[PDB]
């Protein structure tokens, strides 16, 4: 209730979130402790500092007029509140594939350059975090213009959602489903970074005279910063500058209203006309929702950064850390073979759900990881050594039948070993989704932890089929294919 009490709690939260990593075994304990301080501050504040009297659909007409006055397409689509994805665009006419149906000029966008020329300019030129973090600079740019009643982007800000499904909005028990998974660490870092950045910039705004002219000095609640960073991470683009020197982050009105579907990237930027463009990924009939393809991101990135779980994600993947140990007898040769192939000695690879399960780089690593001494010499010496390295990532030309049997045996054992590290099984996860009534945010976490295990289980079956196949070629002594 008192400004001095908030200054005390933010300074305590700043010191709590600035401490180093407490170790993987204590990250959940620190996460609950940080939530306790954040919720204590949030329950003492008044939510969003700037609220609007009308509903969200009431401001879309002003968004269409404001965009039309600056040369953006406003015909052929309408805003419809869909249940599955939220608000989106629906075609009012038939749209054929590869048809340019949406263009947004540069003037309508909110970029890092427009943040430097705004009221945040003076503080941007002095604060080191804003200069190095363009995403954070975009968030405060969105907050300052939101608190500016006469802002140029007011028709756009009044149409943004007031809440998101990022893990920052999850409850403690909803994040609890992600225990013993790979994704929960990124949820911990996201909550710790957001809590630290808010407490830091709250103290700077109240003390640094360069922020005295900012409207955030009158009111800057945690709900404002959680809404700001969530609006950025779920909607921001990476576009080139007006001259094409470097890249920059931007909020693109109208274009960021299309929801995600599987396909190819059809949203591009035209530098000659200085505008964002979107062509139809597929044929949209009148009355159908207009979808685009966001990117080849995994469901873990869609949940944490985009705020939704996408079923049938063709690019879903899990991480797997592999490396050659220095205690290996053949470490010197294996490190040299990998170095000549452009592959590190130890890295974090990926396991994909769709075929093939392993990429060309991971296959080349697993082959060298299981090579004998004779096979390592043939990749290091002679006139045909460079030719052998050139085909390490090709599944058609193996090193030997024995090399394939050993690499697929190792992958089947490693993927099965990672499956035993989760606190639940695949059958138990499917049982919860069927016999329990859950929220959307709870379903996102359970289907995320289930998706990790389904990718691991398919890798076990894929490695077992390959292991048994190359075992037959080894038992029958079949001739090895030669790349000619």
């Amino acid at each position: 209730v008192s400004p001095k009490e908030i200054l005390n709690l933010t300074s305590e939260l700043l010191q709590k979130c600035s401490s180093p990593a407490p170790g993987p075994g204590k990250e959940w304990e620190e996460y609950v402790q940080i939530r306790t301080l954040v919720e204590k501050i949030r329950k003492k504040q008044k939510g969003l500092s700037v609220t609007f009297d009308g509903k969200r659909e009431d401001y879309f007409p002003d968004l269409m007029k404001w965009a039309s006055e600056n040369g953006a397409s406003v015909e052929g689509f309408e805003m419809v509140n869909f249940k599955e994805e939220g608000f989106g665009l629906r075609a009012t006419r038939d749209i054929k594939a590869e048809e340019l149906f949406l263009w947004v000029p540069r003037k309508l966008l909110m970029t890092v350059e427009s943040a430097k020329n705004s009221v945040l300019g003076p503080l941007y030129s002095q604060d080191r975090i804003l200069q190095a973090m363009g995403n954070i600079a975009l968030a405060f740019h969105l907050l300052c213009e939101r608190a500016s009643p006469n802002s140029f982007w007011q028709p756009y800000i009044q149409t943004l959602p007031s809440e998101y499904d990022t893990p920052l909005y999850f409850e403690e028990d909803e994040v609890r489903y992600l225990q013993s998974t790979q994704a929960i660490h990124d949820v911990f870092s996201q909550y710790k970074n957001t809590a630290r950045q808010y407490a830091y910039f709250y103290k700077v705004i109240q003390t640094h005279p360069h922020a005295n002219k900012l409207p955030l000095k009158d009111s800057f609640t945690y709900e404002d910063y959680r809404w700001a960073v969530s609006s950025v991470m779920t909607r921001q683009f990476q576009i080139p500058t007006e001259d094409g020197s470097r890249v920059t982050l931007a909020l693109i009105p109208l274009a960021d209203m299309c929801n995600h579907t599987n396909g190819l990237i059809t949203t591009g930027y035209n530098l000659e006309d200085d505008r964002c463009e979107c062509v139809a990924l597929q044929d949209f009939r009148a009355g159908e929702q207009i979808y685009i393809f966001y990117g080849t991101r995994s469901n873990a990135e869609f949940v944490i950064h985009s705020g939704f779980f996408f079923d049938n994600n063709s690019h879903d993947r899990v991480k797997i850390k592999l490396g050659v140990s220095k205690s290996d007898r053949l470490y010197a040769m294996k490190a040299e073979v990998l170095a000549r192939a452009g592959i590190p000695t130890s890295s974090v690879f990926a396991l994909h759900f769709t075929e093939p399960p392993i990429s060309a780089q991971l296959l080349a690593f697993l082959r060298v990881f299981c090579m004998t001494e004779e096979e390592l010499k043939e990749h290091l010496l002679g006139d045909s050594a460079i030719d052998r390295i050139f085909t390490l990532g090709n599944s058609e030309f193996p090193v030997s039948w024995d090399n394939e049997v050993k690499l697929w045996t190792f992958l089947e054992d490693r993927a099965s070993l990672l499956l035993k590290t989760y606190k639940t099984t695949i059958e138990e996860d499917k049982s919860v989704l069927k016999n329990h009534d859950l929220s959307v945010r709870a379903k996102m976490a359970i289907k995320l932890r289930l998706g990790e295990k389904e990718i691991l289980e398919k890798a076990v079956k894929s490695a077992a089929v390959n292991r048994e196949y190359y075992r037959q070629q080894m038992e029958e002594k079949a001739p090895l294919p030669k790349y000619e």
Partner: peptide, 18 residues
Amino acid sequence: TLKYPIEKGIVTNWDDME
């Protein structure tokens, strides 16, 4: 294809200490 394909909601780095 496209000259400058852009990604909706591209993953960025928010770790200010990294």
